[PDB]
Amino acid sequence: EVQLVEWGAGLLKPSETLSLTCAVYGGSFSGDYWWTWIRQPPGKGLEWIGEIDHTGNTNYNPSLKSRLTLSVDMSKNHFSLKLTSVTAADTALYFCARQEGLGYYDSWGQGTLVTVSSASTKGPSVFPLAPSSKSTSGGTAALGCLVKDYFPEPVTVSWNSGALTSGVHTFPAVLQSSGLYSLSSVVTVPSSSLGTQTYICNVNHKPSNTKVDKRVEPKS
Amino acid sequence: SYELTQSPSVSVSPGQTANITCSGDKLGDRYASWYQQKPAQSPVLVIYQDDRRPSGIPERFSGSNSGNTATLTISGTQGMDEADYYCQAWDGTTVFGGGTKLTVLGQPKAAPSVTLFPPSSEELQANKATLVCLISDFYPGAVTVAWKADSSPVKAGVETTTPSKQSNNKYAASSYLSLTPEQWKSHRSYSCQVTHEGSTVEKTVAPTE
Numbered sequence A: 001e002v003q004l005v006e007w008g009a010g011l012l013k014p015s016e017t018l019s020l021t022c023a024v025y026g027g028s029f030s031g032d033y034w035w036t037w038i039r040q041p042p043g044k045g046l047e048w049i050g051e052i053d054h055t056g057n058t059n060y061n062p063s064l065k066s067r068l069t070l071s072v073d074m075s076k077n078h079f080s081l082k083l084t085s086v087t088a089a090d091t092a093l094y095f096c097a098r099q100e101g102l103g104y105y106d107s108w109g110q111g112t113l114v115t116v117s118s119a120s121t122k123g124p125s126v127f128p129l130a131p132s133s134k135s136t137s138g139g140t141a142a143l144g145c146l147v148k149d150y151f152p153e154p155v156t157v158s159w160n161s162g163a164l165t166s167g168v169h170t171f172p173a174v175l176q177s178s179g180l181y182s183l184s185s186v187v188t189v190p191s192s193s194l195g196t197q198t199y200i201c202n203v204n205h206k207p208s209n210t211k212v213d214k215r216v217e218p219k220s
Numbered sequence B: 001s002y003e004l005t006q007s008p009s010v011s012v013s014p015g016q017t018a019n020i021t022c023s024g025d026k027l028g029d030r031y032a033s034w035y036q037q038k039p040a041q042s043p044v045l046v047i048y049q050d051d052r053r054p055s056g057i058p059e060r061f062s063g064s065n066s067g068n069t070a071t072l073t074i075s076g077t078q079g080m081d082e083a084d085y086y087c088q089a090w091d092g093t094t095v096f097g098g099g100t101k102l103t104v105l106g107q108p109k110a111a112p113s114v115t116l117f118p119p120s121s122e123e124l125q126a127n128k129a130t131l132v133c134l135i136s137d138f139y140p141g142a143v144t145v146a147w148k149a150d151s152s153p154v155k156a157g158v159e160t161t162t163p164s165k166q167s168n169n170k171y172a173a174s175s176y177l178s179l180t181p182e183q184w185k186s187h188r189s190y191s192c193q194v195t196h197e198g199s200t201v202e203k204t205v206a207p208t209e
């Protein structure tokens, strides 16, 4: 095995070009090795990006072959990556790796996270999720608030200014392809209360200095 | 375009044998390798050249490539084997499978609760439409979510979280479907279908509600 050490700044804005490098200890840039980049979007699988040999032949994945250039500095046993016209969709953990003889990746770098700041500070839209009894236990209903398209984390959600805590489930946010977050908060309450008890979700997004108190009324 | 298929999730009881499989046309003509990946860590090669084990990989890991299926067999599965497992096939070109999450069961299985909300009238007035599919109290922490427009799988618009551990050691996840108001109002219904451990729960909402 060999030791692979990748560096590179991870934090980079979009539409641009990404650039990283990797260093190799205990090996040589000779023979049949293919020096490889593989990436992993958050929550997703491994995606082969491209390879380069010691002479400088390359193979790139057709999906981006037009936009990706690999290079090697044979003198210091380094290879490097350059990807053009990027997005938040290139956000991913990027690994360098060595492909050995019959097509297996014996040595991997630690990975470098390419978080792409495509978005800027943005406060959420808040929509009411009107009560439904279809999925809850007898005599109860679930209602909530959809907290849509904010950045960065975090948002906080209380109910009835914190008087209502029992039965609240605020779900971890999704990080969308747009680079913005959305989350939902739901509370299960007595069905008999719906005509007399007011339900308000208190949404606070400190990064944008935004507060929303959204009344969640039954719908008819 | 060449394709290796693996199931997204497998669970095994401690000490039992786990089989993780990967299929592809004429996979037997290609050399299969397997990688173990634990969270925020580099994949680790556990099998190469169909059935060879690197020095330092435990003997309970074995591999085979026959019948056009590559199989990673872990005998006497231990807690420490919980991880995502990727197959890879090489013929000169490299293809990875989609990964299998192996859960080594530490508690009994728990089936998900699914709540589906339609777009709110308020959001439709803002010329947008989001369906919200909330999934909770499930174990193993692995689900597949499929959305349907009437009965047809959607082509676009889905954002789904990875499962996260709840305070009670079960898991939660959420999935969102983004539509235009015209798409929402022009179908009879949309459905969120959640598959967990080979069982499926499908909830459905309709614009007339």
Ligand SMILES: *[C@@H]1O[C@H](CO)[C@@H](O)[C@H](O)[C@H]1NC(C)=O
Pocket: B017, B018, B019, B064, B071, B073
């Ligand atoms: C696992 O798969 C192998 C084939 O590769 C088979 O011989 C064995 O019986 C399987 N064992 C289990 C427990 O599924």
